[PDB]
Amino acid sequence: SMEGILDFSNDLDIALLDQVVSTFYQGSGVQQKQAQEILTKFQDNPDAWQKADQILQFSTNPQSKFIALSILDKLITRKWKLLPNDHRIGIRNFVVGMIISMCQDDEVFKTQKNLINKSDLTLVQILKQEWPQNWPEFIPELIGSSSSSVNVCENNMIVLKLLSEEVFDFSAEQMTQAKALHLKNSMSKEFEQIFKLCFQVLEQGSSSSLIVATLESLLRYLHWIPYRYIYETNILELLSTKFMTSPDTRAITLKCLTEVSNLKIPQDNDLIKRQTVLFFQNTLQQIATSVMPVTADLKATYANANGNDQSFLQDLAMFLTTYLARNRALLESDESLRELLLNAHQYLIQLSKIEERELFKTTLDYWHNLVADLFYEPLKKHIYEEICSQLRLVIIENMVRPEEDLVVVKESDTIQLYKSEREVLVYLTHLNVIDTEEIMISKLARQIDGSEWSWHNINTLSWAIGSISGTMSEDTEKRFVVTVIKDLLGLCEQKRGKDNKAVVASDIMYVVGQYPRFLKAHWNFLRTVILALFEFMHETHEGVQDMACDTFIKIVQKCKYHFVIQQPRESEPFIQTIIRDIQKTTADLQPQQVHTFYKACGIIISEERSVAERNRLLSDLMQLPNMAWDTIVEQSTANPTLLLDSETVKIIANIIKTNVAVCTSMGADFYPQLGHIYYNMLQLYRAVSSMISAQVAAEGLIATKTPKVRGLRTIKKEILKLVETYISKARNLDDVVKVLVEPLLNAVLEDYMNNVPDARDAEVLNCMTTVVEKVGHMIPQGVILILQSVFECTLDMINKDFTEYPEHRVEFYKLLKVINEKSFAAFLELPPAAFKLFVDAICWAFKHNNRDVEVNGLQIALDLVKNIERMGNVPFANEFHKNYFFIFVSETFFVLTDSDHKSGFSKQALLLMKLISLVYDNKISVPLYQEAEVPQGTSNQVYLSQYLANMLSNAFPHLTSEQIASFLSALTKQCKDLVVFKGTLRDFLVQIKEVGGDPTDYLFA
């Protein structure tokens, strides 16, 4: 029964509307849902706007009138110019009238703010259409009506605020360049009057609600008005004194002064410099006497969260940091301004103690600006020595976890904050190394005396200590490091229980890992560190083993050289000792941790540049996996059912993962190890492939979800990853081509092509991409074989929707992209029907929202056009243009204009400009039209314009022929200028959203 309002042949029953509306907003469950769908259908009826005049007159429900205005807003912004001029005048009149009467009824003006604001915005939509050309008296009459009533004056401030926002803040996306400039100039022309009203209202006090609304509009004006309105009037005095005293106006006023601190200002006027000092002086004075003194505990105030304290302290931080980053030099020379300068920074110190992540980042960004300047600018740092000393403590005490202390999901927001904290603290250490050391030593003493002992607190200090590595001299660092480690070791002894002893042990290893300079110069110490880590790899307490492994490879990455040479009082390079005891050292580690250990050993081994010794170290390192490997290749090949034994499958996967880990470290140097296993590894790839196929055959597609098949596919994926990892880093490409590639392709390509879709590994595509990348130029027949084996069968997997097989989707277009780059000849060899699928595949990529596909699709298209162009005037290029030029032009235009691919706008525009420029540089030798459909001799330029005119006429039938003609004329003129080209496209995207766009808009550039 609620569906009655959807029958427009009858009169609209306002009481029925109000019931649907109340059921939606105040109802629940099924009734609410049904009313929602009804209201949506009502609002979307293209004639609903005719019944808004009724609703606004006779409804007593504010939600119903709001919806009526939403309906009018759609009409005004999209179909205004299609109306008979009688309706435009009428709609304007009963919007103006409705606003007047709501402002004259104090009760309505007080209780229906939502509805008045909506009516104001609706009015602004009319102004964007009608003003000032068809409404020159709007502003003079607005100023006149303001004096007759406080309520009307206050509401006019809201209208002007919304007008300024719509013209200056949100026009870039929503109107054409020409219309935006027209409205900006119109507002600029009449602002003198507007400001006069605004200043009179502010100066003569009155309703606080009127004052606040006027200040809210002023905030918008400050985004664009010339500086003279601010510095040649008394307004700064009003803002920085009067309006800071009252809490009602204090929040908006502080935001206004923040924006004032960003005005375009001449930097040579001494008077203006004094005015900029003065309003800062007044503001800080009002804060100290009306809000809180410099000594106040802002941390506690913020935590209590009374009233709007949190927003105010946020706004104060923004004001102080904004002003001081721009103007603090104004305060640094005059001794009468020193107290102000330091009081301002002392407020920031207090603000920096608040427990609020995002606010801390705002203040920290400022501190970075400051300490960087004190680090470089002569004679400044002495001014801020007491501020900086306090800041050292704030930052040390608020240090967050770096990426390396994994003893507690990775937290990327925490990691960025750590790096910002480190940068500031490093500057602060250079500014006064002695003060920094003393604070850190003192903090450490209070960890030992239990005054501030805690897990969080010892971690925080150890992170801070590790973060300043590289700032002290080597002697000071040496004494500093020794003291810290000494004190930390005594702290580990002091505590009982493994949980306490674990935290401290991890902090110790973190600090040492951060001071490689110290480790490099103290071998005996470095040796003892490693040996202690090894013994931690046997500790079964949660997190110890992980820490120990991470610290091991971190130290190795930085000190590898001291592991590869023989040290004074040693008989062998320490890497040999590590390798000898590797089975013992890693016996208690999980597989992932074992692989990290081997990877660390590979880093060391790669620093041995004697080939024979490096290869021997590599052989010794791989002894355990190689022996396990030789065994399996003997057994697994004898009885292929073992590969169903899940323990043999796991052993195999971990052997290969060990090889990947070492190959990751050694790259080109890994080749000898790869050769030891390569041929048997590819045979294993084949045998595993047969088992997966045989399992899918016997059990169905569900087999791919079972642990056994997933374990077998892990083997295949790690083999592909191993080959990919080596080839991506190989230096001898003759061996890659002549030894590795042909066995690889024979092992993987046919298996991929002849598996059912659910059994094909997307990693095959990823491995082939690396092969083509590195040696594609050397294997033209191999690349052809890749396309023949993966192109059509993969395309058929991904060309039915945009969601199935997401990994194959992404890897598919990465492969086509590199083939198009490195081996374009392979596409030339395709049969015509297959090359046609190639074009279809590229356009299919355009239409993805998935950035990981859309971007490559657009890049393949661009590269392909360039590949064709490079061929010159040959039959293949001429056939390409005849067959595909307009397919690419229209497919590109489609994604540009369909509002569902805005992420790819820049590359769509680039591709479109390239295509259009081909014709206007006469880079296409043959006619693009049929011999019949156009007179002989017509230029491709003319035909392109006609094709596009017809295409856009049918796709956007509501555009006038003149709009289309002006758009294309400007677009083709501008096809050598991307920024302007894109502006014209964005103008077109605005105009297709409405009726009656001005065709002269396209002459803006």
């Binding site: 020794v482 480690i485 000494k486 070791l489 580990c492 042990a505 110790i508 005996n524 110490f525 003892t528 560190v529 040996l531 202690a532 013994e535 931690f536 500790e539």
Partner: peptide
Amino acid sequence: LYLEEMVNSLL
């Protein structure tokens, strides 16, 4: 734990 040799190696 052989954090003990660590103390000595440091002094």
